Swiss-Prot record, chains A, B:
SUPFAM superfamilies: Mog1p/PsbP-like (SSF55724). Gene3D superfamilies: Mog1/PsbP, alpha/beta/alpha sandwich. It comes from the Bacteria. This is Effector EagT6. InterPro entries: DcrB/EagT6, Mog1/PsbP_a/b/a-sand. Plays an essential role in toxin Tse6 delivery to target cells and specifically in the loading of Tse6 onto VgrG1a. Pfam families: DcrB. Homodimer. Two dimers interact with Tse6; this interaction is crucial for Tse6 loading onto VgrG1a.
Amino acid sequence: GHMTLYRLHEADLEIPDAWQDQSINIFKLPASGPAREASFVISRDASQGDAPFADYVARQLENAEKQLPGFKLHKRWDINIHGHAAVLLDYQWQREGRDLMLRQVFIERRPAVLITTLTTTPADLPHHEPAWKQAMQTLVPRPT
Amino acid sequence: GHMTLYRLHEADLEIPDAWQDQSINIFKLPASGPAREASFVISRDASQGDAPFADYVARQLENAEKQLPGFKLHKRWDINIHGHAAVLLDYQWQREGRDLMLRQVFIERRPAVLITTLTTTPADLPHHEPAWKQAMQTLVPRPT
C-alpha cells in the first residue's frame, strides 16, 4: 500500500499512489470597469510520456488549432520558469458567436505538466493582464 | 500589493485576494473486481461567513433534503479533526435515476469550509471504505 503525502492549500493528507489525480485549481477574476469576469485555472497533464517537451507543446497547439472554431494564434513564447521549460500561447476562438481569448502557459514537470490558463476576451485581456502577470511571476514549481 | 501565497502540490504562487477560489481536488479510487471506480473530491465553501458552524452544517443538510431527489441520511457524526470542528454525513440520493452513496466531511476552516466527498454506490461502499477512512485519518488541516 504505497502512499504519498499530498499538499493542498488548506491541508495535507496521504494519498495512495494508485489513486488517479485529476485536481484542478480554479480562480474567478472579478469584473472591472468595462471588463467582465475571467478565470485562471491550473490543471495537470500526465500525457507527455517520453516525448520532448517541444513536441508535447506542438501537439497541444495543433489540437487547439484544429478543434476550436475561429482559432487564431496571437503569440507563442518560449520562456523559463525557475529552470522549468515553458511555453506561453495567446490564442482566441469563437464560442456561441462570442470571441474568447486564452493565455495559456505549459510548464514542464514530472509526473505531470502544469498548465495555467487565463480565459477572458480580446478586449478584456489588457484589463486582466496585470493581475495575471503578478500571479505568474510568483509561481515557483516545487521539486519532484 | 493585495495578495496571498497559495500552496498546491506542484507549486506555490501569489494569488490576488480579490480572486474567488473554486478549486477542486479530484482522486479516482480504482475499480477492483465487481466494485466500480469511486471518487474522492476536496472542495471549498466560503459561504459560512460569521455564522456558527453548526448552523452552516444544518443549512447544508436542508439544502440536500430540498434539492437532491431521493435524499436519505444514514448517519451524522460530529467529530474533531486536529482541533477543527467537523461533521461527517453518510447519505444517499438518486442521481439521474440511480442511487449513490456519499460520505461527506465538512471541516470548519477560514476563510472557507474544507469539504471532502467520497462518492460510490451502496454496493461498492464497503469495498472503498478502508482506503477512504485511512486517507481521512491522515488529513491534517493547515493553520491559517
